[PDB]
């Protein structure tokens, strides 16, 4: 991406009266820092989104977020399908982003420590099926990574993490004032389709090849 | 390239006792600035290289320098065959670079003006056959650009260049400490940094350029 750009386009669903949207973030490759960045950030946004957006704002039932391990590149995505105006819906997405922005500074030490212990036991587990660990290993094999002990490595990194680390992860990469902003949204229209700033104008994507015409490509990973 | 690296590898000849080498520069896309930058820099290092290196220094007969237009990306290339140690020859390459460094400060108004007039008639010359201009046009068509009046546009730009511009061209882009260093050499040794062992590992971790919006 061009490191600060946000583009979007729309697709009209003929049949269904519901609208879809998905917002995507190209963080980085899978370095040991970025795995724990994205896992921790994913864990901290699960329950307040669960609390306010689907429950309280009653947007819809399709409200998903999470990782994107693809092409040796890590990534962050948000999957929400509800029957709303999409820019309105964007406004409440950004409202949840500001909510998390305040929720950064609202973290105690205890919430931090119990939260990363929760993520640790969420991540660390011996398998319960031979097929389970085989699908994970095979998921390495299709990505040619082979980092067999990434778990203990990532936990050793996980113990070395501060609040200010994710602040510095937020400000340049994730915040609205970001020189490292890799943000892209996609609109899926419907059948007939407390503070918001001035977002920049995106552009529509008539030709995705001509879209990608001036976009560079990522390197691939040195295999472990 | 990762904007600073200078990578190299070697190839061993069988038949000829002469050694080859070629040094390449990823400059930028064909913008109107970069066309002038590279053409005028290449021509201003063309004639003193011929005067010093080949004529005066008498290194060898196969000595070449110059542009490389490919994939909508400009480039700079140097083709020298001689029977030498390749790093020895590199030292004289860097010596010619220092020679140019002094030649920056030795430019008069006259050298500047005769040089850009040289460049001008070098670029701006009417065709004498349909196949000539057709080959030029076809050379656009293979890059799908169609900027038919890039000649007068770039020449109108050419007058906007200064001497001090080429200092600005030298420092970040061309020097040895350069932050914008896109430098790569290739050794083609005689019959008898980091190394480049695997071209697969070459392609394993490098980004790709954007392409040009065609005019």
Jot down its keywords:
about 220 residues; 2 chains; part of a larger assembly; amyloid beta; 6-stranded mixed beta sheet; alpha/beta; hydrolase/immune system; globular; 8 helices; IDE; Insulin-degrading enzyme (chain B); 6 strands
Overview of this structure, please?
This is part of a larger assembly, with two copies of chain A. With 224 residues, chain A is of the alpha/beta class. Helices cover 43% and strands 14% of the residues of chain A. Chain A is built from eight helices and six strands, in the order βββααββαααααβα. In chain A, strands 1, 2, 3, 4, 5 and 6 form a six-stranded mixed sheet that branches. In chain A, strand 4 (62-67) and strand 5 form a beta hairpin. The PDB classes it as hydrolase/immune system. Keywords: amyloid beta, HYDROLASE-IMMUNE SYSTEM complex.
């Amino acid at each position: 991406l061009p490191d600060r750009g946000w583009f979007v386009y729309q697709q009209r669903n003929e049949v269904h009266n519901n609208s879809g949207i998905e917002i995507y973030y190209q963080t980085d490759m899978q370095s040991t820092s970025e795995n724990m960045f994205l896992e921790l950030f994913a864990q901290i946004i699960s329950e307040p989104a669960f609390n306010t957006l689907r429950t309280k704002e009653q947007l819809g039932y399709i409200v998903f977020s999470g990782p994107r391990r693809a092409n040796g590149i890590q990534g962050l995505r948000f999957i929400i399908q509800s029957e709303k105006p999409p820019h309105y819906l964007e406004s409440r997405v950004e409202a949840f982003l500001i909510t998390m922005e305040k929720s950064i500074e609202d973290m105690t030490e205890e919430a931090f420590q119990k939260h990363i212990q929760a993520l640790a036991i969420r991540r660390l587990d011996k398998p319960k099926k031979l097929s389970a660990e085989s699908a994970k290993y095979w998921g390495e094999i299709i990505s040619q990574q082979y980092n067999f002990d990434r778990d203990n490595t990532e936990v050793a990194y996980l113990k070395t993490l501060t609040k200010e680390d994710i602040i510095k992860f937020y400000k340049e990469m994730l915040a609205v004032d970001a020189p490292r902003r890799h943000k892209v949204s996609v609109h899926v229209l419907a059948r007939e389709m407390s503070q918001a700033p001035a977002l920049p104008q995106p552009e529509v994507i008539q030709n995705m090849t001509e879209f990608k015409r001036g976009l560079p490509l990522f390197p691939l990973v040195k295999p472990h």
